[PDB]
Design a binder for this molecule. Structure first.
Ligand SMILES: C/C=C/C/C=C/CCC(=O)[C@@H](O)CC(N)=O
Ligand SMILES: C/C=C/C/C=C/CCC(=O)[C@@H](O)CC(N)=O
Ligand SMILES: [Mn+2]
Ligand SMILES: [Mn+2]
Lengths: 332, 332
């Protein structure tokens, strides 16, 4: 009768399986810089912007012309293994990548066809910059909770190679334009997939509780000074919302799985919220920003390291273009 | 305890408001054909493929460089008026268009910012070719049903002008390639938006019951002979599913609001299912295929014509690239 925060949380939604794919090829910021040197020289800019301002030592790239759907499909096969279920069990497949094979059909229908889903399997893409994998989790969770389905896949493959190819070409003949282009050189490749399920079908798997979103769509035109200040302001509001629904206090969370934009942005965020940096696994310095796949890759890598115990409270969160901010909880 | 079809239907989800935007400019197939004549002549093809095979007399185009987000925003303003609510009430805004301003941020965040949504408003894009507006309705419905929100916007703006510009340029210097390009000349421009709400907040508005999806993702590579046969096979399965959940028999539905691909595809569909053509409003011959906006535009135009009575059972359905097929019901 009387609303309470906890009411909107999911009771019956679990994480059956989880996997990631590291893209194989290392591209160092040192090697990029040699290609950019002569235009560093010409513009008169003596600063290693990627290595010294962003904090990226390297990113991963695909070795071949991998489509988003291929990377997602690889990750999905691994996640099904992790969940020990066959594709016939999946009732929903949501693709959340920024990378996209086509305008139509959906990347999800391409991945679904690759995997061999059944005729009952609903499929579509969600796009929301860096936050879409959490949005896909929540969309799937609602359907699991209600019982419309028993198992869902949420998949995300990202490819940056053609971005890099083109960006590096376009900054080897203006400072204003050239500084805009440096930011694409912090992106990386990779994939992730998650099998979600109804909790009773999967007794004692990790629980997805759901979470909260706040937005500042007034800022949909985004600098980087401004992405940062407005982004932190938005996160603050969002943490209030998380307190009100999830009961969050920063000190009670065991791990923060955080979308990563750059070394200084992350530092600023963790400082502003008094987060312990030891609870913030980071892959940005050697993998770059994997867009919406960053959050589930980091979760999967935490899992694989044996970094988690039954009961551990894991915060999934990011700030995305929009601006949007989403915060959700997994209890391992 | 025992599942029944009706269980998954939404009980508490209504349609508060609905609007569409007709794009202003008429472009006749006669005028296109004069531009294509000399390449009709060169390839030796004497058939009016657009006028005589597709059945499109004209399509609507924008007069100016309208972005999808602008068209969606226009439609959304009209829908809020139709619902007699201000933007502050909206808790969710989903954009479903194929047309898209950017890779990031979402088109939805751009529309949200234009409208002035509150900081509590969740936003994202769903992409699923021609069926995404029904997918967006259902995603919103789940959140309305559970009470996470009270009012949602589902918006869709489409623009084909740059498609036309480029396609007409690219077929005025191979038959195989040229026939592939004729199909883009059946697309049209337009927009639609829908305000959904919790039924008690909106006593006696149209009810959204939800619906069903079946898929044939084996066919994500799609001819047109094959789009048709496999598409009808898929629709047949989907109608079985609709029977099992919604209780559908074709003769008990009052109106069929059907995504439209072409005159012969529609004819084939309606024949194959024994549908009465008088219950199938069509705008394709003068507006062309508006992609995922086609279904809500047709619904809105039915509304505006005074074509609906309290209690009327309206079938929303389409076949989309994937292949996917979705079928849902509104009770006016
Ligand atoms: C901590 C503050 C961060 C400011 C936000 C920047 C937006 C980041 C990006 O551009 C992408 O990496 C993620 C995204 N945009 O959705
Ligand atoms: C009635 C049979 C139809 C065959 C399906 C064709 C796909 C149609 C399209 O290409 C678009 O108009 C709609 C869509 N593809 O999602
Ligand atoms: Mn290599
Ligand atoms: Mn005009």
């Amino acid at each position: 009768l009387v609303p309470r925060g906890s009411h909107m949380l999911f009771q019956n939604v679990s994480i059956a399986g989880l996997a990631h794919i590291d893209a194989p090829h290392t591209l160092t910021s040192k090697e990029i810089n040699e290609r950019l040197q002569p235009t560093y020289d010409r513009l008169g800019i003596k600063t290693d912007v990627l290595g010294d301002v962003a904090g990226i030592h390297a990113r991963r790239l695909w070795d071949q012309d991998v489509q988003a759907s291929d990377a997602a499909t690889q990750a999905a096969r691994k996640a099904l293994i992790d969940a020990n279920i066959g594709i016939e069990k999946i009732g929903l497949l949501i693709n959340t990548s920024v990378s996209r094979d086509y305008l139509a059909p959906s990347t999800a229908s391409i991945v679904s066809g690759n995997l061999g889903v059944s005729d009952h399997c609903m499929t579509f893409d969600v796009a929301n910059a860096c936050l879409a994998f959490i949005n896909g989790m929540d969309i799937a969770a609602r359907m699991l909770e209600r019982g419309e389905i028993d198992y869902a896949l949420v998949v995300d493959g990202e490819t940056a190679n053609l971005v890099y190819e083109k960006t590096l070409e376009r900054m080897t003949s203006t400072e204003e334009e050239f500084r805009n282009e440096l930011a694409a050189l912090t992106l990386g490749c990779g994939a992730a997939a998650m099998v979600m399920a109804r909790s009773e079908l999967v007794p004692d798997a990790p629980r997805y509780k759901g979470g909260v979103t706040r937005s500042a769509t007034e800022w949909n035109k985004l600098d980087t000074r401004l992405l940062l200040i407005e982004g932190i302001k938005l996160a603050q509001k969002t943490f209030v919302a998380a307190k009100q629904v999830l009961g969050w206090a920063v000190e009670e969370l065991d791990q923060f799985v955080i979308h990563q934009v750059s070394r200084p942005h992350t530092a600023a965020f963790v400082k502003s919220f008094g987060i312990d940096p030891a609870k913030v696994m980071t892959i940005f310095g050697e993998h770059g920003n994997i867009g919406p796949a960053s959050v589930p890759i980091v979760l999967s890598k935490l899992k694989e390291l044996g970094r988690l115990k039954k009961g551990d409270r894991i915060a999934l969160l990011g700030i995305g273009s929009g601006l949007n901010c989403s915060m959700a909880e997994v209890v391992w």
